[model samples]
Target: RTLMTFVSVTGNPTREESDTITKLWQTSLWNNHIQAERYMVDDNRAIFLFKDGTQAWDAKDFLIEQERCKGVTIENKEYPG
Candidate 1:
């Protein structure tokens, strides 16, 4: 079954960086099976949509791991899809 999830990350980023994050969602997981789109970007926020449950969770885990390595605080939640 196909599914979609919205992920909103709150952080400052360049316009290119915002775009890059969307690209990462595709390249980093699901063997390019995932589709990602950036719906919003600004000085303090970037909103992205990731298609497929596997891709969404994979990307979320990657982000959590990255933040852990960087000593950044992480607030994560999981919901059944």
Candidate 2:
């Protein structure tokens, strides 16, 4: 099943560092069969438009395991897809 859940992250210091994590993160999701569009908000925030609600929740906690990841915010409300 698919879910219209969005997840956003925080705590990177530079846009370059931001992509560094997203690159690995992108692959991280792919390995688990989760796909989404990644967008960089401002200098140090990374957000993803995930198609799986469970996966969205799945991604958050372990995501914090990364030292690069200081924090993550999930969007629970409906998104205009």
Candidate 3:
């Protein structure tokens, strides 16, 4: 099964901004190997499903490095199907 990561963002992005960031992430290098599935949990929260742990961590790192989310917290473990 695909590995999944749950992320909580405190940026409180609007729908427009969320879409913009989603598009940016889709084209990001972190997504080169596998296209992640993004779920909008709330106005400032999301979940991403990746192919593996490496992919999930890479994406998390990239998000922090790029400062895409105002407040980002990643769950340390992968999710089960």
2 against 3, candidate with superior lDDT: 2
Q: lDDT tens string, model 3, 1-81?
A: 566666544356786677667557646844477567777777655667775655666676666555455434446653221
Highest TM-score: which candidate? 2
On the 0 to 100 scale, the lDDT of residue 27 in model 3 is: 62
Model 3 error, position 45 (Å): 1.4
Q: Residue by residue across 5-79, what tens digits does model 1's lDDT show?
A: 444333555657655654554455546455555454443233445554445665655654542111111134442
Q: Which stretches of candidate 3 lie over 4 Å from their true place?
A: 8-10, 71-81
Clashing pairs in 1: none
After superposition on all C-alphas, the RMSD of every candidate to the true structure, in Å, is 6.2, 5.4, 5.1
Residue 15 of model 2, lDDT score: 78
TM-score of each: 0.43, 0.70, 0.65
Candidate 1 total steric clashes = 0
Best of the two (1, 2) by TM-score: 2
* CA lDDT scores, all candidates in order: 0.45, 0.62, 0.59
How are the candidates ranked when ordered by lDDT, highest leading? 2, 3, 1
